[PDB]
Amino acid sequence: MVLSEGEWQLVLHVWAKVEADVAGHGQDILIRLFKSHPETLEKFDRFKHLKTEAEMKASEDLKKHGVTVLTALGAILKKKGHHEAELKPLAQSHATKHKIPICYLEFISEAIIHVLHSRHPGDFGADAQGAMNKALELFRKDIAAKYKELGYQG
Ligand code: HEM
Ligand SMILES: *[C@@H]1CC(=O)N(C)C1=O
């Protein structure tokens, strides 16, 4: 699958808004993930003690991680599909160390879409949401292929 340049521009135009405050967006996204699919929190030995949204919001460490996650994803999106170099270490760690199934990457993709839809109606209309879905699908497709190369079913 291949996104058009027009599609990449819709992706990067909403990402430009995320970048006004990546820390805020990362908190929203991880909290949405953990609330919508509580099982995902159990993968984080670092964070699985957090009991409530209030505790999550107050966690400086969770905020730090959200910035790390969105910055890595931002770097991937800015490659506009040319993300082989970026996907190698991410696939290896997430397959082998963290053991994150592809379904959980689907869950975080859903969280990203939900947060952008909520925060950014001006840059996340139907066409833009479709482009972001396509970008995130491409990301998961390529990650899943790497998972298989690495010996993880996903
Ligand atoms: C958009 C998809 C994701 C991106 C871009 C991303 C990015 C990252 C990055 C950059 C790191 C630090 C370096 C590394 O270990 O590779 C990391 C760590 C980690 N990721 Fe992800 N991640 C994603 C999805 C997920 C999901 C869905 C889960 C769990 C359901 C997860 C679980 C973890 C865990 C447990 C760590 C180690 C946290 C720690 O103890 O420091 N990741 N991730
Ligand atoms: C998706 C949901 C889950 O718990 N696993 C392990 C999946 O593959």
The structure was resolved to a resolution in Å of: 1.8
Give the separation between CA 31 and CA 37, rounded to whole angstroms: 10
Give the separation between CA 7 and CA 68, rounded to whole angstroms: 25
Integer angstrom CA distances of residue 154 from 21, 27, 41, 96, 98: 32, 25, 17, 10, 11
Would the CB of 103 count as within 6 Å of ligand 2?
yes
**What are 5's two structure tokens?**
């340049």
**What are 70's two structure tokens?**
């969105």
Q: Is the four-CA dihedral 57, 60, 65, 68 of positive or negative sign?
A: positive
- Other C-beta atoms lying within 10 Å of the C-beta of residue 18: 22
Pick the closest to residue 130 from 2, 11, 16 (CA basis): 11
Give the separation between CA 30 and CA 52, rounded to whole angstroms: 13
Method of determination is: X-ray
- Other C-beta atoms lying within 10 Å of the C-beta of residue 19: 13
List the domain range (segments joined by +) for residue 33: 1-154
Q: Which residues of 74-106 are buried (b: 16+ CB within 10 A; e: fewer)?
A: eebbeebeebeebbeebbeebbeeeebbbebbe
Ligand 2 center–CA 13 separation, angstroms: 32
Would the CB of 42 count as within 6 Å of ligand 2?
no
Integer angstrom CA distances of residue 91 from 23, 44, 45, 152, 153: 23, 17, 19, 10, 12
Q: How many domains does the chain have?
A: 1
Give the separation between CA 2 and CA 22, rounded to whole angstroms: 27
Q: Per the annotation, does 25 bind a ligand?
A: no
In CATH, what number is assigned to the domain containing residue 129? 1.10.490.10
Q: Per the annotation, does 37 bind a ligand?
A: no
- Residue pair 63/23 in contact (Cβ under 8 Å)? The answer is yes
Atom number, ligand 1, closest to the C-alpha of residue 90 = 16
Integer Rg of the chain from CA: 15
